Amino acid sequence: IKQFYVNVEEEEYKYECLTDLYDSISVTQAVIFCNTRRKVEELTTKLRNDKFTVSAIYSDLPQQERDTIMKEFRSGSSRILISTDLLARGIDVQQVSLVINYDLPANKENYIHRIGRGGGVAINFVTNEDVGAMRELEKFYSTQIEELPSDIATLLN
Ligand SMILES: [Zn+2]
């Protein structure tokens, strides 16, 4: 799993960075994690308005609804699956090649459950306010989270 970060500088630039990235890296399906249900719902709404097909999973969903959502994703009906930090470990991201942390994990431990299973590329969005916490992450683990390259056309090969 290759781990990168994009310094979006401020929360407001995250949405545009996500959609531009989505096009630039030419990926089809991706999983996105946010730290709160509210952010998941808001990002899902914006994405859908922009014509993207998205599925969202929340804790308040009964097992039936979650299993439906997953089938929606696995079949390709939805190109994007968005979930919360709390549900990351319970989400069986298949061999999805791209995972995006729209919000940098606030719980350092949960980070390894938010980077996929090898598809494997994980991209972390950080603002000037989160950059520090990211460094702590690199220490908490013995890994290296590199700044995303200027040219990612061949990112996921
Ligand atoms: Zn764990």
Side-chain angles (χ1 to χ4, degrees), residues 66 84 89 109 135 138 145 150-151:
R66 296 181 183 179
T84 57
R89 57 185 184 61
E109 197 286 328
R135 303 308 181 187
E138 290 178 292
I145 304 174
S150 183
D151 173 5

Side-chain angles (χ1 to χ4, degrees), residues 15-70 72-76:
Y15 187 69
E16 187 71 17
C17 178
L18 167 62
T19 52
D20 289 344
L21 168 63
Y22 185 80
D23 269 65
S24 294
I25 55 189
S26 295
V27 181
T28 296
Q29 289 206 122
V31 176
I32 305 180
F33 290 113
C34 293
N35 290 180
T36 62
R37 155 170 175 165
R38 183 194 302 176
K39 186 75 69 75
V40 171
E41 305 187 310
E42 289 179 54
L43 173 60
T44 295
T45 294
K46 278 187 285 189
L47 280 174
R48 278 169 178 165
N49 294 330
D50 260 350
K51 302 298 183 60
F52 296 79
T53 51
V54 50
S55 292
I57 291 189
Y58 309 105
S59 296
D60 306 299
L61 299 185
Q63 186 63 199
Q64 165 174 157
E65 190 51 55
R66 296 181 183 179
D67 287 353
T68 292
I69 300 302
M70 292 293 85
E72 183 107 56
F73 187 59
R74 299 232 301 184
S75 74

